[PDB]
């Protein structure tokens, strides 16, 4: 047996946890702005985060600072896409979103951006 909506609903429940800031064990600092979340979810969506949190020394870090010049709006939108599988691209940010996805090693998102 397989559940058509189990994955989407589990993702929504994780997003509910994030919005309520429950058991969130890490905070990412991009452009001097903070975004709190869980390490497991981040490493499940990004090669960069997978590398960082599979590193036995860096996985203990509850605070992580990325490249400071990564656009904050792009990182926020990509985090929301991680937590809802939905990406709302727009004319005025697609380049920044693509650059941030490249930095995060999210190949499918970068490739999708290449098309638009």
């Amino acid at each position: 047996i397989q559940f058509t909506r189990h994955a989407s609903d589990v993702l929504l429940n994780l997003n509910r946890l994030r919005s309520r800031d429950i058991l969130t064990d890490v905070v990412i600092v991009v452009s001097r702005e903070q975004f709190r979340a869980h390490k497991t979810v981040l490493m499940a969506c990004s090669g960069l985060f997978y590398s960082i949190f599979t590193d036995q020394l860096k996985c203990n870090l509850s605070v992580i600072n990325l490249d400071p010049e990564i656009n904050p709006e792009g990182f926020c939108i990509l985090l929301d896409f991680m937590y809802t599988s939905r990406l709302n691209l727009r004319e005025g940010n697609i380049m920044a979103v693509m650059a941030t996805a490249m930095y995060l090693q999210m190949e499918h998102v970068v490739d999708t951006c290449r098309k638009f």
Partner: protein, 342 residues
């Protein structure tokens, strides 16, 4: 002790809701096209409040466009769900609105109120999944309630008026409604026969076939007669999935909000329940521990209650938390999951 106006506010949706002061009535016996929402499985009666929390893209877009243009939509009284065919419906009007963005999620909270009844000629589905229906609009005592003063006074009234009925039928229905609620105050029930009949029809805990049969009636006196009969024949409520189990009796129900014994509430997932409040339930089993988030009755903690010999979901517990509250224990039950018996 509990305030009886609080539940009607539906505070759990959100205290800040953009609100609209307005009303629009279509000329009777006119022909107009109305949009209807993708799935609304309830026979909405005029004057009855309806809360919704919508999620779908097309739903949010169409309701947004609605509130921009005309602020009303349609609710079809489906004779049966699977066939998706119906011949009457009710226009509902938006009177409270709010759009909520939650970390990429989008939802819309809304509260509406029924206005007019109508007959549907035919309905056509446009490309974007909205259904547009062509539709023709259907046309429409002593200050003290002391016993002896009402007795001789009503005899005198009957003698004088018919020396050669609306008030009498309304009075008897009000007597029954008061039997349900001692605290019931007359000024709350509208004096206009039409509004009173609609309010009573909404309060009645009855199945959908009777609901539509009552909605089609075009005269206030006929509604009052039919309601009188139904009220004075209803015996008890039984689990829909057992066909015979006493969950509640006629005398156990007690109004707890101005709307009446029964009202409409909404779930965190957008599904709508019609809840009926009673201070005594039988053959129900509790699962879990008390919770209070998104509670329908502020100050009370709900616990799911399942038909214990049926394993089907029926109602909730609603135990008060503070120990100065009069109803330290009552129950809510879902009308959709139980049927009248006789």
């Amino acid at each position: 002790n509990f305030d009886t106006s609080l539940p009607t506010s539906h505070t759990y949706l959100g205290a800040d809701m953009e609100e609209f002061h307005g009303r629009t009535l279509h000329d009777d016996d006119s022909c107009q096209v109305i949009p209807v929402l993708p799935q609304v499985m309830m026979i909405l009666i005029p004057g009855q409040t309806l809360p919704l929390q919508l999620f779908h893209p097309q739903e949010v877009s169409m309701v947004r466009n609605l509130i921009q243009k005309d602020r009303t939509f349609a609710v079809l009284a489906y004779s049966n769900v699977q066939e998706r065919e119906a011949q009457f419906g009710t226009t509902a009007e938006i009177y409270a609105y709010r759009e909520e963005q939650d970390f990429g999620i989008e939802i819309v909270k809304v509260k509406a109120i029924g206005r007019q009844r109508f007959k549907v000629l035919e309905l056509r589905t446009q490309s974007d999944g909205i259904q547009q229906a062509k539709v023709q609009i259907l046309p429409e005592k002593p200050v003290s309630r002391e016993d002896q003063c009402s007795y001789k006074w009503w005899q005198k009234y009957q003698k004088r008026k018919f020396h050669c009925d609306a008030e009498t039928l309304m009075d008897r229905i009000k007597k029954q409604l008061r039997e349900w609620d001692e605290n019931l105050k007359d000024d709350s029930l509208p004096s206009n026969p039409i509004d009173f009949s609609y309010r009573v029809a909404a309060c009645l805990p009855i199945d959908d076939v009777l609901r539509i049969q009552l909605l089609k009636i075009g005269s206030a006196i006929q509604r009052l007669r039919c309601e009188l009969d139904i009220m004075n024949k209803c015996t008890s409520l039984c689990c829909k999935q057992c066909q015979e189990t006493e969950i509640t009796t006629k005398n156990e129900i007690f109004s707890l909000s101005l709307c009446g014994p029964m009202a409409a509430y909404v779930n965190p997932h957008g599904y709508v329940h019609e809840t009926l409040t009673v201070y005594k339930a039988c053959n129900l089993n509790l699962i879990g521990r008390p919770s209070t988030e998104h509670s329908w009755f502020p100050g009370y903690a709900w616990t799911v209650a399942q038909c214990k010999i049926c394993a089907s979901h029926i109602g909730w517990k609603f135990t008060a938390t503070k120990k100065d509250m009069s109803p330290q224990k009552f129950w809510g039950l879902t009308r959709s999951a139980l049927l009248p018996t006789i």
